[PDB]
RNA sequence: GAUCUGGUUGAUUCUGCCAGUAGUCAUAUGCUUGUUUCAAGGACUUAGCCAUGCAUGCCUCAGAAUCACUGCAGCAGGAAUCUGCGCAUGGCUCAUUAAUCAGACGUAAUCUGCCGCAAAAAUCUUGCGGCAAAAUUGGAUAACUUGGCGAAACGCCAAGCUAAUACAUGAACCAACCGGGUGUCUCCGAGACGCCCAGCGAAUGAAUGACAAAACCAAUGCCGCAGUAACACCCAGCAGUGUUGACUCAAUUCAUUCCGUGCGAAAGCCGGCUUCCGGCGUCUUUUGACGAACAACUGCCCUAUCAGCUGGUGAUGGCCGUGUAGUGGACUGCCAUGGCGUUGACGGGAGCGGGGGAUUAGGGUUCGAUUCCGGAGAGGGAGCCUGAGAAAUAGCUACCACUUCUACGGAGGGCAGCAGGCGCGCAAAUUGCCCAAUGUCAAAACAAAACGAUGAGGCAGCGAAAAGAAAUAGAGUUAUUUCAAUGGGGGAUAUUUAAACCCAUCCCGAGACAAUUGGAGGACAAGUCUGGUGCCAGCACCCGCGGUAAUUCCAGCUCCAAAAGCGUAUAUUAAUGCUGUUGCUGUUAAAGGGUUCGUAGUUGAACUGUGGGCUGCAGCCCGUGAAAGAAAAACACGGGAGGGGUGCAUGUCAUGCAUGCCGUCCGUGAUUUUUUACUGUGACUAAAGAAGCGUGACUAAAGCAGUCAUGACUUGAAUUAGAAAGCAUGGGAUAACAAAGGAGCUUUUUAAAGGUUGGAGAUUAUGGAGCUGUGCGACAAAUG
RNA sequence: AAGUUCACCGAUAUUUCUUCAAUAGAGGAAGCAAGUCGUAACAAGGUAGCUGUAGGACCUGCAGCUGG
RNA sequence: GGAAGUCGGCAAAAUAGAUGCGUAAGUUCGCAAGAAGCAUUGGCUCUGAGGGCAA
């Protein structure tokens, strides 16, 4: 039904100025949700600064020069999302979309043999025709023969270049997770104990590396490794460590004083 | 046209609602089918989403299953004998779900003899599995009594005006005795 | 329509428009600093009021509070940068003693007068408006320019000026 | 809630009583609401008893809840 | 900044109102306005009527060209038409409406084009005259030509040509695994062979979709019962194991109809290598995402000179059905007599709802047609087609009210889209330029013969709404002459801009380029100045001036307040403890009912509790008794634990390539276990707006940028509050709800009588364990 | 394809009833703002005043109050 | 066509049974009231409801 998107109604995760135009590009249906996605036109023009306007952003995309998960995408309304690999072979830059500690979208540089895998969270399991088991991930993928020990909430390590799963990480006590929603988004913690309330939401308690304690809904956690030491994915610079605003304000004042 | 909304109904307090919006296409209804006995005649209806419904107008054939033996056969409908809503539907001979009908008993008698070797098979031959399955197996007298008469009561289990079929199941047990008392 | 630029007001007319004690006190300030109209004085009254209410709310209601360490040193940094407060004094109670003349001192028109470049406040006004004065090699034409203490020793004549 | 009337067939009326707070006067206010519930034959509640009800699909014009438990008196 | 002043008396102290005073992105009007930046703008009255013009179309290397089309040399560009997609979005308005909306939620009651990741083994076709194998399939229609009808009509007729990714038809062997039913052969029940049916999806019926100690008989496996997933050979582990809080759901097997709504390898189109290598496009099945429809947990104006409303005439519920995409009195038949209401139903009246704006010490009062979100409408009222989606209106049909052209036969219209008019009013712009930016659509990247549309949107004009910055000089000389500086203004190789504009930058130019609007008794700053008039003219928001000496009228001079602004009118906030919860009055100023009884409602007495010992440190069975017994526990689940802690065997017809060297975790059944409210934490909680972190856009109103030297700052864009309702959990002092009304109120110990056997199918006895009539030993008892 | 018959949704018109808001009218009644005829009240106001009621500026009877 | 006839609707016409719905001012609360007004009705073939005495 709806086809437009006003700029004021657009998500604040993007950085769009209210005084520049009335409209924002409406993402198409696809792998990721509208409210938790970054369209390809925003990445090319507003973040990488490769395109000065939206006319030049169409020249780059309709030539198939941008590959997402080892596949060209020529739609500027394509909804790229969490744990996605973006590669531009002409410029030789590879990125991964993650959340920083504050909660904003972050592009993390990657290298070869690391830009070949991605992590997917299982959200549903069902039996298809012929009695085959199928698992649905958080980005729309459908795996037709998962590990027999796979369960809802676990993380599957995928190989985008060759298209088979390589490993499985289970979700239970004593594991490393990253929060992907709420007020604690982008914080890397460690599962302590999960409360199970049938019919309602489940609450998970996590402790940071520094020892800070926090909680969030169980649907907002994403297992990424056995513990904080051996993570299976490169994280942004702060390593999911939230700092006090009082100290934060002080260092920037000192650093800028000596910046000149 | 016809609508299925609650805007024209009174509130539980007895008051009247002031309608301030026009009728929407999403809440429409359609006229009934009033299926009847006779030679087959159906008409398709395009429903929401592009799907199709088969509105049957006349039918005289259907699929009826013997639940005890877990079999089924295609037979011909003979008459309508009972309707719980109103006996004016029995007079008009309309076919709806859960109505009671009488179907042809000839195909079921033939399968009975071919399986259990009982006639209500020219040569016995080596085929003597009849005694193999006739043990620990009995047939109620009520079912067998009307099998030799020529017709057997059945219950319609499908919605003829929504799918265009009249499929059913044979009455047995306490359900059979319930309806045999009303019909007398 | 569909415009989201913001705007607000900066001054406020006084109640009781005919107080004798207020009328003569404002006339001393207007002629001492060379101001053009009473709207300049009423503008300073508004910013001074905003400073006081922030401190009074922050002073004792929240006690030692993360909302007191924050924007408790920011105001002092703001006050010390422009010169509205004494360096020795570093408690929020001492910002409540700020007066209108103190803020009026740290004006570009006043600073030029006390620096010896201009003989009188009215002469300083015409110099700034004539683009004969620059701060850090930048021409300034606004007599309301609040000079920061860091740029105090940077104010001089303009290179492009005949002076 | 509490059973209020059992004069129908496989249907009861329950009432919920609560206090509403008026901010201006800083005082409370007695209010109530009435719901129509379907009573299964497995239960035999009397007027004044306390019941636990759970939400289901529309079963009639007014019924949207089902009785799940009954506490004597 | 938590503030007041004048008026009732001859004076005085009160109650009480009137008047003064400040604000308003609140309008209108009058007199004035040098410069610049930023902005609202026919809502109010008439959801009144509208001439004219424009507002939605789309072609790439990649769906159909024989233009009787254009270049040159078959190539290229190709008008027009068929085909596929879109036109259900955007824009405008606020008439209706007590539901709609806000926060929070359900669909396990459902539909879903474009987009993402997936799946696919039915269907005897073709050529030849039984043999072959890369399927060389068929009919018709536009554009076009001919003849035309009509006054015209986004009006029409007939004949003749021919395309497809339009329409229709249709592919055997390559090519497997598995199952059900049945006829003739061999061995003694086993095997072989022949035949019928066995694909995705749909309807009906039947199963699966788990559980939580020995003898006897018939048939069976292995050496007589020790090993022991299951299974009569090719396969010796080719599923004994779906998900959820929960399912008649997912999925599998059997039977009948299927298919009697459906299902092509588009019988499709382009390139690169020398034949296979890619890029597109399309049908069916399934579930993510984007949506749609339905449902209701708490909140939501005034009115009693509106107290009863509904009632098989559907009102509340039940049964079987119909209809729907789906649940449902949504609807047909039958049955019962219910549902709502002084905690305000029903009726009447004014209003679209929020985020939010104004003002305010706190508590509050008031506004919200208008930029973002939701709802509704397109002159009024109905009905419908196409489509994934409409009860569509720059779609169709009919009626009513207006209205246009005509040759009188007939045919048309819908500006609450953008500009423009007429009326209406106290009240609101140009019949302008452009797709350069932001977006939408789509057969689509830009360039090359070769430029998609867009009154959405942008940007100029008009425009003292409102909001920032700022000109109308400066320094001296003896009162009257000396300097310097220039901005308005006029120009510029130029800059800006889609082109313009503005702005910035540079340069011929002064001491008329000359500021107004209200006042001068008091409130309230400022004349005892001078003429004229004489209760006349007039002033005066209130008190009050004028009757021949006017502090107030009409003028001159002087002075006062604000100043490029200043008066007047009408609404609103504050002043106002003059609506009083915080926080008002009631003897005499306004106001206690003539006196009682009484129902909803509001309010309601005390009690179940000093812990001790050695400001601290650590410990106590934390009154007294009595020392494993005594004052969440306890059975059972290997389909529970990536069966958790505390080279030698085993097999070998093995891809066995394997296998081993006391409290918790999970799920199930029994046992009695107490809420609400208040309070402390935690989770979840659109932007814009408000509070504020950083930053010299020359300052500011703003904005989120920027700063430093083939690039760095890993640049930055931090945080906070947001009614009520809902979720999890800790505490028990003050309270609430519910129940009773006080005479419906031992344990333990043995003895006695009774009523897993290899597996699968029947039969039997014993033993549990409970249940009674006995007997026995021990221990308590809050009342011998 | 046109065309018969029935059921359903139902514009429009006519008539009858309910509710809300406005409207004319000979003639009568009742208030407010700007010459004559009498003093009912204020002093014991020249009959002390006042409240309810009944009858004929007001007067009289009955019961009450002091605001005598 | 519809009282224009005539002193005057005199005389004639006109309404009409039963059942369902509906019904004004006024009032001595009994009435006014069959106020006024609107709808249905045949024939045929069927269905449902309404009882007694004998075990
Ligand atoms: K109402
Ligand atoms: K454009
Ligand atoms: K007198
Ligand atoms: Mg200069
Ligand atoms: Mg077409
Ligand atoms: Mg719209
Ligand atoms: Mg517009
Ligand atoms: Mg085949
Ligand atoms: Mg039903
Ligand atoms: Mg309101
Ligand atoms: Mg809107
Ligand atoms: Mg217009
Ligand atoms: Mg105007
Ligand atoms: Mg516009
Ligand atoms: Mg004067
Ligand atoms: Mg004075
Ligand atoms: Mg009084
Ligand atoms: Mg009248
Ligand atoms: Mg007297
Ligand atoms: Mg007549
Ligand atoms: Mg005559
Ligand atoms: Mg007569
Ligand atoms: Na200028
Ligand atoms: Na209007
Ligand atoms: Na408007
Ligand atoms: Na096709
Ligand atoms: Na509103
Ligand atoms: Na509409
Ligand atoms: Na239009
Ligand atoms: Na082009
Ligand atoms: Na401009
Ligand atoms: Na007020
Ligand atoms: Na006050
Ligand atoms: Na903001």
Curated annotation (Swiss-Prot), chain B:
Q: Please provide an example of a Pfam family that matches this protein in its UniProt record.
A: Ribosomal_S8e
Please name the CDD domains in this protein's record: Ribosomal_S8e_like
GO cellular component term, pick one: nucleolus
Question: May I ask which residue range the UniProt record assigns to the signal sequence?
Answer: none
Keyword annotations from UniProtKB, A to Z: Ribonucleoprotein, Ribosomal protein
Question: Among the record's GO biological process terms, what is one?
Answer: translation
Q: One GO molecular-function annotation for this sequence?
A: structural constituent of ribosome
| Source organism superkingdom | Eukaryota
Q: Which family does it belong to?
A: Belongs to the eukaryotic ribosomal protein eS8 family.
- Under which name does UniProt file this protein? Small ribosomal subunit protein eS8
Q: Which organism is it from?
A: Leishmania major
